[PDB]
Design brief:
By secondary structure, this protein is α+β, with helices and mostly antiparallel strands. It contains three helices and seven strands; from the N terminus they run βαββαββαββ. The two termini are 18 Å apart. The protein binds adenosine-5'-diphosphate (ADP) and magnesium ion (MG). The site of magnesium ion has 4 residues, from α2. The PDB classes it as transferase.
Length: 152
């Protein structure tokens, strides 16, 4: 795998632009917030981009027409945090780990791979954490990665 230094917010922009047309067609309200424009990490850019894509795809599918999506990025000094929130029904306790299992899906033509791929990339590849909470009238997926891979 290739690791590079890049601005994580520029990557989020790239993912927004990828989805921009779907978001418009579905009349989804998309919101973005950051506490540091210059959110630089050393990470596997293609794979982190894939995490963002998988989460944003799930958010669109969960929120549906006229829904709402918010992405927040936060500089936490030795690590960065990205949150992808959508308005929609909550995830029950009994599924909060199961949703990350390969092939688990509640969708008719679901792969059930989006989140298992996310977990592999964030946790195994980057040494980070990914989890979900129910917040407001919706669901947030949060990941954190170190700004630089942790020296052994
Ligand atoms: N934003 C979300 N809100 C509610 N449920 C979600 C969300 N994202 C994922 N899920 C649940 O996690 C399951 C697994 O997601 P994923 O691994 O991406 O597979 P797929 O999208 O193909 O079902 C989904 O089928 C859904 O039940
Ligand atoms: Mg998915």
């Amino acid at each position: 795998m290739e690791f590079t230094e890049f601005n994580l917010n520029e990557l989020i922009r790239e993912v927004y632009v990828l989805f921009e047309e779907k978001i418009r067609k579905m009349n989804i309200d998309f919101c973005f917030e950051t506490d540091n424009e210059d959110l630089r990490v050393e990470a596997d850019r293609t794979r982190i981009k894939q995490v963002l894509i998988n989460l944003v795809q799930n958010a669109i599918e969960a929120t549906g027409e006229n829904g709402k999506i918010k992405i927040t990025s936060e500089d936490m000094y030795t690590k960065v945090r990205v949150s992808v929130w959508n308005s929609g029904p909550p995830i029950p306790e009994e599924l909060k780990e199961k949703i990350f299992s390969p092939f688990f899906t509640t969708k008719t033509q679901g792969t059930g791979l989006g989140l298992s791929i996310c977990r592999k990339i964030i946790e195994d590849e980057h040494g980070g954490k990914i989890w979900t909470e129910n917040r407001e009238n919706g669901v947030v997926f949060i990941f954190e990665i170190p700004k630089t891979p942790e020296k052994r």
